[PDB]
């Protein structure tokens, strides 16, 4: 089977683990240990082909840069997650982008910019327009998700797999 290696990145509390666990187990999990990194694997049928997805749910606790870089180097595609309710998490996405680019050396690395917590529109701090503009600058797609309602959760993982499939 094809094995699509996805890495979740983004600053704290944006929904990396909630997105992962919604995708994996169809549950909205709200208290998942913020410092716990873990990997997940499951079989999925991608455009009719049975494949395996491997998801590395990073937690930013590998502060030792060689280790963090090794984790990123193993990834084939990235979900770069921020929370639409925390502007500082959107600002932080630039750092994850640079980190990935330093390691993968490929500006076309499979990569989605993911604005999570789309069910909290009344708490939005990051405009759709400014996030789309950043994605356009990076030539990546922008998708807004809700790990709570499941909105676009399958989409971000499947579309990222489609980029891995096409590009590698
Ligand atoms: N309302 C809402 N809350 C969310 C969503 N995703 C995550 N959360 C909450 O935000 C907190 C942090 O989520 P988590 O996935 O642990 O963040 P991480 O640090 O990026 O792994 C948790 O308390 C979740 O319940 C979402 O899409 N909508
Ligand atoms: Ca987490």
């Amino acid at each position: 089977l094809a094995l699509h290696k996805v890495i979740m990145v983004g600053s704290g509390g944006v929904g990396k683990s909630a997105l992962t666990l919604q995708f994996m187990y169809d549950e909205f999990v709200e208290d998942y240990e913020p410092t716990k990194a873990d990997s997940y694997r499951k079989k999925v049928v991608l455009d009719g082909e049975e494949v395996q997805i491997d998801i590395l749910d990073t937690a930013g606790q590998e502060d030792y840069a060689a280790i963090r870089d090794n984790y990123f180097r193993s990834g084939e595609g990235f979900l770069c997650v921020f929370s639409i309710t925390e502007m500082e998490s959107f600002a932080a996405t630039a750092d994850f982008r640079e980190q990935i680019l330093r390691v993968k050396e490929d500006e076309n690395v499979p990569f989605l910019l993911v604005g999570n917590k789309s069910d909290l529109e009344d708490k939005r701090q990051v405009s759709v327009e400014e996030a789309k503009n950043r994605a356009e600058q990076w030539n990546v797609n922008y998708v807004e998700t809700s790990a709570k309602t499941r909105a676009n959760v399958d989409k971000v993982f499947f579309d990222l797999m489609r980029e891995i499939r096409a590009r590698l």
Side-chain angles (χ1 to χ4, degrees):
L1 293 188
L3 177 62
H4 295 315
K5 297 172 164 259
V6 171
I7 299 190
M8 312 296 291
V9 303
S11 57
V14 300
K16 291 183 301 300
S17 301
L19 284 167
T20 300
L21 293 166
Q22 187 59 267
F23 181 78
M24 289 296 303
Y25 303 130
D26 198 29
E27 189 82 344
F28 179 46
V29 183
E30 304 178 61
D31 45 53
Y32 185 82
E33 172 48 47
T35 66
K36 177 181 185 61
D38 210 342
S39 58
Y40 300 83
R41 202 172 278 198
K42 83 190 286 194
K43 288 166 172 11
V44 300
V45 188
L46 175 64
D47 295 312
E49 177 199 4
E50 194 173 35
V51 306
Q52 279 197 108
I53 190 171
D54 187 282
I55 300 159
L56 178 62
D57 180 26
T58 68
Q61 313 297 313
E62 307 294 4
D63 285 337
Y64 279 58
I67 298 177
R68 187 270 313 285
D69 286 355
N70 286 343
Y71 276 113
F72 284 19
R73 193 173 302 106
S74 82
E76 294 171 326
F78 302 75
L79 292 184
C80 181
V81 184
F82 70 95
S83 166
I84 68 164
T85 71
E86 189 199 18
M87 173 62 78
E88 293 93 334
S89 78
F90 177 70
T93 61
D95 304 336
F96 293 106
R97 173 96 181 152
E98 288 304 306
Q99 287 157 10
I100 290 159
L101 289 179
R102 288 201 297 267
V103 169
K104 304 301 292 184
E105 295 170 311
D106 171 11
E107 292 267 2
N108 279 341
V109 58
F111 185 116
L112 274 71
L113 182 65
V114 176
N116 190 47
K117 311 207 187 178
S118 68
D119 61 288
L120 299 182
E121 178 70 36
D122 49 314
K123 302 286 191 217
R124 180 186 289 275
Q125 293 188 3
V126 182
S127 70
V128 169
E129 179 183 307
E130 76 189 306
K132 286 183 174 173
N133 282 344
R134 179 166 294 193
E136 196 178 357
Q137 172 191 330
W138 291 352
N139 189 28
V140 303
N141 287 312
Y142 178 55
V143 179
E144 289 196 344
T145 59
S146 172
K148 183 175 165 68
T149 71
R150 257 202 155 253
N152 287 335
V153 176
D154 282 350
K155 177 168 174 67
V156 293
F157 284 100
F158 273 71
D159 281 357
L160 183 59
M161 283 192 290
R162 291 174 171 120
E163 295 190 2
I164 296 168
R165 184 188 66 207
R167 297 196 204 166
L168 307 199

